Design a protein around this ligand. Structure first.
Ligand code: MG
Ligand code: MG
Ligand code: MG
Ligand code: MG
Ligand code: MG
Ligand code: MG
Ligand code: MG
Ligand code: MG
Ligand code: MG
Ligand code: MG
Ligand code: MG
Ligand code: MG
Ligand code: MG
Ligand code: MG
Ligand code: MG
Ligand code: MG
Ligand code: MG
Ligand code: MG
Ligand code: MG
Ligand code: MG
Ligand code: MG
Ligand code: MG
Ligand code: MG
Lengths: 147, 52, 52, 52, 124, 187
RNA sequence: CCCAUACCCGGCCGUCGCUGGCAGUCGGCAGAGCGAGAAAGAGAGUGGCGCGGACGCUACGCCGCGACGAGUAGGAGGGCCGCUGCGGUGAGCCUUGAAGCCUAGGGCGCGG
RNA sequence: AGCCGGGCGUGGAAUGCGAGUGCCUAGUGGGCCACUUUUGGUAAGCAGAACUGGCGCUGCGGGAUGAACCGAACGCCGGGU
RNA sequence: CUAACACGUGCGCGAGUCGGGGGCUCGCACGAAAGCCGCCGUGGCGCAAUGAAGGUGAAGGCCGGCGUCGCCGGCCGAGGUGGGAUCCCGAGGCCUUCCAGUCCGCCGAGGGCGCACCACCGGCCCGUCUCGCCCGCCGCGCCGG
RNA sequence: ACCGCCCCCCGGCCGGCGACCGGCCGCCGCCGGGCGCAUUUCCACCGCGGCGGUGCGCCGCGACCGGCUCCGGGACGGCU
RNA sequence: CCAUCUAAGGCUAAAUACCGGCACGAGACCGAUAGUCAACAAGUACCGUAAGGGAAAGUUGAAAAGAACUUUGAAGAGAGAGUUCAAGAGGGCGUGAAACCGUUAAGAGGUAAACGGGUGGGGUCCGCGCAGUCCGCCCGGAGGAUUCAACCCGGCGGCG
């Protein structure tokens, strides 16, 4: 609202909060990002290093869909299925292990970060990591690849 | 200019919260009277009548 | 109460909605001061004026 | 409070009918004039025509 | 409760009038006619009011009952006292004190009653 | 004439919440009375934290709360947090706790109640323990907000691991001159 | 001996600090204190007539002590300062005279 | 060199005073003067530096007058010095 | 005034959050509003980083089984030091005819558990360098770890 | 079929009915009508009557007390 | 080696666009120096050879009831008279400000005027001033009431 803005409190002060020595002129330093290498060089180098120059290869017809690969972590791994699944597996005595499919829930690669509760799991995914594999093996379980 | 931001959007949860607060406050005689409504003769301010 | 759900029952007509939680339940400040268990753990009220 | 009293249904003659219905849980929702005012302010701007 | 609706209504009442660096409250059962938590006649469960009688003489004392808090029609009991000033004040004082009914308003009710009474007496 | 400076004459701390809602203000009334008529400083700390802003009352997670209450010595005491208790999904076993907070997530409340604990609000806390004995005062990680990765010693300056302000992350965005010894210099 | 807006004493305004005090209006159902140099209980217990008592407390309120008060560029706060329109509200005002305009009249506010 | 565990409080000069820390940020980037030190210049109310204080941003008593000198810095008043 | 960005503040929800586009609501005074969608969350932002790229992708600490253990189990579990508001304990200490003897509450040497946060030391993930040995097989290789 | 949640019925506890009560009894208060009948109670008037509070229509004076100041007059004593 | 189409010929509604045009509805917009340049005989008057440029300008009153008639003057223009609630609305007439001017009243005047502080003097109006406040509780005196306390009946309320 215009009621609460600084302009209302600024009426009557000739200057309008912009100084008498240096006025409020149009474009004292140039428009936009001008002088990035000449008279704004200090600011550009101090606050945006690496701005100027080229690096890396050019990929012309990039399609993000080819590289689409969402990831999940082992601490979140048990949240894909319902709690009743996990508790039933926990108090089960036959040794049967529930099957968790991350592709069904929309994940492609499993990365092993969190601690895993001690019960067998059949994790089926598209890609695995070495540490996630070893975590699943240590907790007791199976890793299954799907396409 | 005609392309001023005339409209605003509010969260659905906030709208429901406001509706709930208004409904709850409509049941208190002090607030209804302070709104100016003359209800000193009303038998019961959560006034309910049959479907007839 | 089907529209907005109870405290222990979600709203049936809305997808997933429940009444907003209370920040404070017992809003009777008069009681909250005038209850024995809080009055016990209080120092004596100094109420004599000491003018210049 | 969590108490939900019993609300009587008033006949079109103005006298109390035999029926009565428990108070819906909505009327115990917290009163927030802050949210009510914010939602009103921002919504009573969505029925506004442009001028220029 | 009470403090909750007081916080709601302390600044957004239809009975509120603010001018000349003053503030006043208008709702009926409000002794001293001023905006305050104590004297607000719609917030508290126990409320005392003193009004002039419908007849040209007498004083009506209004007491809020304890049961029908949400039933405005049957929430106030009114008693008309039409006697000498001393006995009127004594009756009001007994009603306020010996009933333990909102004792902080005893002197305010007595002052308001005395006033109404004087007003009722013919002018010089 | 007195030889003094008035720059730091006025202190900046908050006297009252900037918020306008009524429930928090009622809590503030109650704890103002408690702090000024009780010698316990727990009430003073709680009232001061009630005054604070949202970013200064970061949420506390269930995992943090159970971790800080599993420490030795602090059994069967009430965990008091002036912020919001949010649920943590990467924790299976949850014990029974006696929690007090201004607001609790629905899922977190369900988890605690299922585990068998009870949820308290600062009002009932006053009734239970006015001076607050048997209380474990916790708080969420204040430096958790991502804005703190942009603060401090400026980037493009030696030994400064400060996140720059870039509109998009990629190989074409602030990677060439100040970030490589191969192109100019490396800070 | 003379006098500055300096210094000392006093009054008043405001700001800042004490993150000072007050929910104890605890009343014939009661007993009116927590200013007093000394960290902490006017502690609870068991054995050898006249019916009576001012104000308060819009707690975003009220009250008490100290110190201080220059200001361009500039920053911030409060305006029960002002103008126009909109949602509420004043059982508001008004042809027994609204708006506007004029005034050697009576006043308020440091000021708008 | 790093680790653990243990014992030592007469808090080891005077004086004064609460301190630390984090964001966002306007205006400014023409200066001038004075004691002392000092470079160029015959010299200048000239040009150029160092320290401190001022003026600029500042009213008041005095120097008749006065941007800078001497005293003293300011809320509205009464008394005294 | 619009758009973008940053930061500070207020509110809702919270590892999620958000219908802005569309649709359903007998279209239509207000209403071009408001309500609803949940198998309309497509999608955005967040929940993972790093590398130019191929790609890779975020703890571990103790005992029994071959210390001059190959290597299976039993476990325990997301570091350590210093400073840390609060809380816990508590030597002692808070009165009156005396005396025995309590209850309850306040005080308090020292001692605990230590939030957030800061500093420091370790640990883990990605790129890169140096050193060196070992292991796996459907294809024993300019393979993979 | 099983599990979780919720609604309803019945049974048993805990708590509230001061955001949410009815009957009975007791106490108290108030009101309306009789009883009461004037050493009680009330209404109005007068006194230049008293006590307490607030003020004087305007213009003035005095007294003592306290704070802050400027000055004067006495007397006593120490190193000397 | 694979994958996928079949160019150099043709047609085709719906979803989409719309500051021109016809006919409508609305508005947290402007309110005659504003809003279109244009609320009115406005793209008009007027300027330029031409391309083109381009204004100013709303309001009597409810109803003209728009001032018959007498009188001075050549007349404009006046004095009477009259209409009207009002001519303190008289045909560019609602309201009618400031700058500026005429007149009346008061005051003053040789350092241009004006200004701040402090008084004094004179004025216009105001106090609707001009024998000075009221309020309890008593004491004394003159009065007058359908009169107090205590009980009974009924109702209501508070508390347990
Ligand atoms: Mg300025
Ligand atoms: Mg500039
Ligand atoms: Mg600019
Ligand atoms: Mg000063
Ligand atoms: Mg400052
Ligand atoms: Mg002074
Ligand atoms: Mg100043
Ligand atoms: Mg004038
Ligand atoms: Mg310049
Ligand atoms: Mg020079
Ligand atoms: Mg300065
Ligand atoms: Mg100066
Ligand atoms: Mg001279
Ligand atoms: Mg002086
Ligand atoms: Mg073809
Ligand atoms: Mg074709
Ligand atoms: Mg075609
Ligand atoms: Mg419409
Ligand atoms: Mg006009
Ligand atoms: Mg006109
Ligand atoms: Mg007129
Ligand atoms: Mg006119
Ligand atoms: Mg004259």
């Amino acid at each position: 609202p215009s009621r609460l803005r600084k302009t209302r409190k600024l009426r009557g002060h000739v200057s309008h909060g912009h100084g008498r020595i240096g006025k409020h002129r149009k474009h004292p330093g140039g428009r936009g990002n001008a002088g990035g290498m000449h008279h704004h060089r200090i600011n550009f180098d101090k606050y945006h290093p690496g701005y100027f120059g080229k690096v890396g290869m050019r990929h012309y017809h990039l399609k993000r869909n080819q590289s689409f690969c969402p990831t999940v972590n082992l601490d979140k791994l048990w949240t894909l299925v319902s709690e009743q699944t996990r508790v039933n597996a926990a108090k089960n005595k036959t040794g049967a292990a529930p099957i968790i499919d991350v592709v069904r829930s929309g994940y492609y690669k499993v990365l092993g970060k969190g601690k895993l509760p001690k019960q067998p799991v059949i994790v089926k995914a598209k890609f695995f990591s070495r540490r996630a594999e070893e975590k699943i093996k240590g907790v007791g379980g199976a890793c299954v690849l799907v396409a | 200019k005609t392309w001023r931001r005339w409209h605003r959007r509010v969260n659905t949860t906030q709208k429901r919260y406001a509706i709930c607060s208004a409904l709850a406050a409509s049941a208190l005689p002090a607030l209804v009277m302070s709104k100016g409504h003359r209800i000193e003769e009303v038998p019961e301010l959560p006034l309910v009548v049959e479907d007839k | 109460d089907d529209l907005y759900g109870t405290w222990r029952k979600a709203a049936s007509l809305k997808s997933n909605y429940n009444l907003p939680m209370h920040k404070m339940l017992n809003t009777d400040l008069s009681r909250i001061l005038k209850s024995p268990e809080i009055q016990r753990a209080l120092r004596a009220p100094r109420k004599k004026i000491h003018r210049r | 409070a969590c108490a939900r009293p019993l609300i009587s249904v008033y006949s079109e003659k103005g006298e109390s009918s035999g029926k009565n219905v428990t108070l819906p849980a909505v009327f115990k929702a917290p009163i927030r004039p802050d949210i009510v005012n914010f939602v009103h302010t921002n919504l009573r701007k969505n029925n506004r025509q442009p001028y220029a | 409760s009470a403090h909750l609706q007081w916080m709601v209504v302390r600044n957004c009442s239809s009975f509120l009038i603010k001018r000349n660096k003053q503030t006043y409250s208008t709702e009926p059962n409000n002794l001293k006619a001023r905006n305050s938590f104590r004297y607000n006649g719609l917030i508290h469960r126990k409320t005392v009011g003193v009004e002039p009688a419908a007849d040209g003489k007498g004083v009506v004392v209004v007491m809020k009952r304890r049961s029908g808090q949400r039933k405005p029609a049957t929430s106030y009991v009114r008693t008309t006292i039409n006697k000498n000033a001393r006995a009127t004040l004594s009756s009001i004082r007994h009603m306020i004190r010996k009933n333990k009914y909102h004792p902080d308003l005893r002197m305010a009710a007595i002052r308001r009653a005395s006033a109404i009474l004087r007003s009722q007496k013919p002018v010089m | 004439g007195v030889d003094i400076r008035h720059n730091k004459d006025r202190k900046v701390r908050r006297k009252e919440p900037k918020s306008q809602d009524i429930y928090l203000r009622l809590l503030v009334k109650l704890y103002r009375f408690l702090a000024r008529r009780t010698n316990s400083t727990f009430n003073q700390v709680v009232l001061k934290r009630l005054f604070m802003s949202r970013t200064n009352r970061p949420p506390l997670s269930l995992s943090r709360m159970i971790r800080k209450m599993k420490l030795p010595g602090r059994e069967n005491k009430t965990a008091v947090v002036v912020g919001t208790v949010t649920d943590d999904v990467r924790v299976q076993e949850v014990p029974k706790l006696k929690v007090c907070a201004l607001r609790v997530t629905s899922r977190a409340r369900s988890r605690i109640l299922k585990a068998g604990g009870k949820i308290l609000t600062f009002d009932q806390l006053a009734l239970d323990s006015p001076k607050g004995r048997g209380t474990v005062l916790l708080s969420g990680p204040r430096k958790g907000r991502e804005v703190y990765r942009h603060f401090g010693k400026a980037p493009g300056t030696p030994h400064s691991h400060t996140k720059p302000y870039v509109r998009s992350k990629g190989r074409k965005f602030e990677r060439a001159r100040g970030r490589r010894a191969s192109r100019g210099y490396k800070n």
